[PDB]
Design a protein around this ligand. Structure first.
Ligand SMILES: CC(=O)SCCNC(=O)CCNC(=O)[C@H](O)C(C)(C)COP(=O)(O)OP(=O)(O)OC[C@H]1O[C@@H](n2cnc3c(N)ncnc32)[C@H](O)[C@@H]1OP(=O)(O)O
Ligand SMILES: CC(=O)SCCNC(=O)CCNC(=O)[C@H](O)C(C)(C)COP(=O)(O)OP(=O)(O)OC[C@H]1O[C@@H](n2cnc3c(N)ncnc32)[C@H](O)[C@@H]1OP(=O)(O)O
Ligand SMILES: O=C([O-])CC(=O)C(=O)O
Ligand SMILES: O=C([O-])CC(=O)C(=O)O
Lengths: 372, 371
């Protein structure tokens, strides 16, 4: 029988959650254009749409925003664990462990969406505590009067952010909430398919998202912009990379044959950030890298993906680069839990096989008869 | 493209680790019959075989046994977490968390098999601490002079086991070390395919193994023997279960269309367990349920699986029934990590598709216009 390794040409579910148009560079959440959501929506409204399948009324959104805000606090045992590990732990290992501890401590049955709301609310608190602890700063408690993105920036900086900063983060999070099928969604679904709990599913999603191949989930492009150091070095660096058969970071995608619509929106909204000398210089480098990259690689359907600008935007708003994968998980958890919820409406155990290519019927020999 | 919901009969890798013959009821690890390994081998020698692909020499096995014995200790952070949660937490949630903590505490690069050795050595220390804490008993530290299975029972009981009890645990663990492809192996491989670390892979395996649909990692057959209560009540209990649309627990397999060879080996080795009155009774019940269940369900290719006897065997050696899935994982981590190691020799990112059946091109309706 045929080996289908990678599963690239196999669908494992029907979905109404996300639609990717790789041809035209379009992305839809439940039929709504990502462009319109970036323009007019906000984190809580899109989270509501992804989980409940419709845009909320004024009343539904006010109640929903309150629910999220009163779930933001974390248990003292989780908070102590983060404080203890923040300086030396891989932050994805910290986040993986704390979501595992959340599930251990929540024994209550069913309520998949209630549990997803709890993880979504608490992950920014955990990330903020890692960042603060790393800088020898005291924990800033969540403020239940602030909206999700506003509160996120408050917990990192210890001061209420400008509405323009809130908007850029709010948009960046909306852009990472779902992207249909990929290794991390597949890990959540394989675990859900056994009727394991939703915390187990998310822990598996975080385990997969951590890997460097996952796509989208890194700060390599930003590292590259820092290596280049000056705008005038862009050409020398990019040519010496490509000619040397090396890769331009933040370029390429398995689906978009064009500019990633998420990269396009991040580049536009990145203009609202006030930039010191360092950030101004890094954005000038990124824009030149973008131009020469598209000139050489665009022919072959190799274009900026979301991670070309995402790392630099998060860095610009005051996040350490090695937290970027955790910030990705804080958004994508909505997509993961939405996909599990949809799958479980008609559950099927995911139970593939393997092709055997070894030996059979070998004769067991005791250890005294094994030579050398 | 093709919708293959459940990936039934989709092959996702090539393997030389494990072969299952569902028609004849046979199983092989690296070409060796499970019957021969159960007759003549031991936990460390089979772990060596699964990881390194051949039977070790005396020198290779002495070194490997040391490497395993030297890694059994757990961090103060892990032992304190286990002690805090042993009486309250789901034991698979505790294991999931403590393997996650192992990963966090090990920031070394590469050495997949070294990290597999660390997880395989430490998991029994965690299981034993859960069990001891539940019984208001003091932690028993691993003894590096004892073999894996000897140590395991020592950490549970606080006294060195008999060689007969050691052999039964040794065989029972070997029988769970690998079973080719299933949801837990698949969860491990999906995570490994991104080049995430081997602890991340195993955390995902444990997360999948916890689910009641996984197969093999449950105590439902033992619970059913305990509900039956007397050997005389077997015919009536089973006939009334099967006539009311319910299942005989520990019967049925997606692959074996005969007696699971792991069930046949556990039944034979269970004879060497010295049994108190309860365990004698439960085994009499189990042997009658087997006889009866084969009579009724056999013609339909429904036979005992490994989990018909496994829960009862682990219970008879002094483990609480609800630790059984952790014990399953303590052996199966060898298979998982061996499968990951094999896969990564020619890695391919696992990135399936979905069929979109939803709405497209909807107008964003401003909130003041909604219902
Ligand atoms: O397949 P894949 O998505 O890697 O792309 C095929 C080729 O496109 C080119 N390519 C893909 N992404 C990039 C990138 N970010 N920078 C440069 N070339 C790229 C490479 O030539 C690549 O071959 P490789 O896999 O050996 O690097
Ligand atoms: O149900 P399925 O998804 O068809 O499970 P599977 O394909 O393994 O075989 C199912 C049928 O075999 C029989 N069966 C399978 N396992 C068992 C068992 N452990 N005890 C009794 N009957 C069984 C039943 O007819 C069962 O159908 P039902 O229990 O839904 O009435
Ligand atoms: O889906 C992918 O290929 C990876 C990705 O871009 C994402 O997770 O957003
Ligand atoms: O493989 C399966 O189908 C379940 C099982 O029996 C095992 O994992 O040992």
């Amino acid at each position: 029988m045929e080996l289908r390794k990678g599963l690239e040409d196999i669908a494992i579910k029907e979905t109404s959650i996300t639609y990717i148009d790789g041809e035209l560079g379009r992305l839809y959440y439940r039929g709504y254009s990502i462009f319109d959501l970036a323009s007019f929506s906000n984190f809580e409204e899109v989270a509501y749409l992804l989980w409940y399948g419709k845009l909320p009324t004024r009343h539904e959104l006010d109640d929903f925003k309150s629910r999220l805000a009163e779930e933001r606090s974390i248990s003292e045992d989780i908070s102590t664990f983060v404080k203890r590990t923040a300086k030396f732990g891989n932050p994805m290992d910290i986040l993986r462990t704390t979501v595992s501890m959340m599930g251990l401590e929540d024994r209550s049955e069913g309520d998949l969406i209630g549990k997803a709301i709890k993880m979504t609310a608490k992950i920014p608190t955990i990330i903020s505590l890692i960042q603060r602890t790393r800088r020898n700063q005291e924990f800033v408690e969540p403020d239940p009067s602030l909206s999700h993105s506003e509160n996120f920036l408050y917990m990192i900086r210890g001061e209420r952010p400008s509405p323009s900063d809130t908007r850029v983060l709010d948009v960046s999070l909306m852009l990472h909430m779902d992207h249909e099928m990929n290794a991390s969604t597949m890990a959540c679904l394989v675990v859900a398919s056994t009727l394991s709990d939703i915390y187990s599913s998310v822990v598996a999603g975080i385990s997969a998202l951590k890997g460097p191949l996952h796509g989208g989930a890194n700060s390599e492009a930003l590292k590259q912009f820092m290596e280049i150091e000056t705008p005038d070095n862009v050409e020398k660096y990019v040519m010496n990379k490509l000619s040397s058969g090396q890769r331009l970071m933040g370029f390429g995608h398995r689906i978009y044959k064009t500019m990633d619509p998420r990269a396009k929106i991040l580049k536009e909204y990145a203009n609202q950030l006030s930039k010191n000398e360092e950030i101004k210089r890094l954005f000038e480098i990124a824009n030149r890298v973008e131009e020469i990259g598209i000139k050489i690689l665009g022919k072959r359907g190799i274009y900026p993906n979301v991670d070309f600008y995402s790392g630099l935007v998060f860095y610009a708003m005051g996040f350490d680069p090695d937290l970027f994968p955790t910030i990705f998980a804080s958004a994508r958890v909505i997509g993961w839990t939405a996909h599990v919820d949809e799958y479980l409406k008609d559950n099927k155990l995911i139970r593939p096989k393997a092709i055997y290519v070894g030996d059979l019927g070998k004769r067991y020999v005791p250890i005294e008869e094994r030579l050398e």
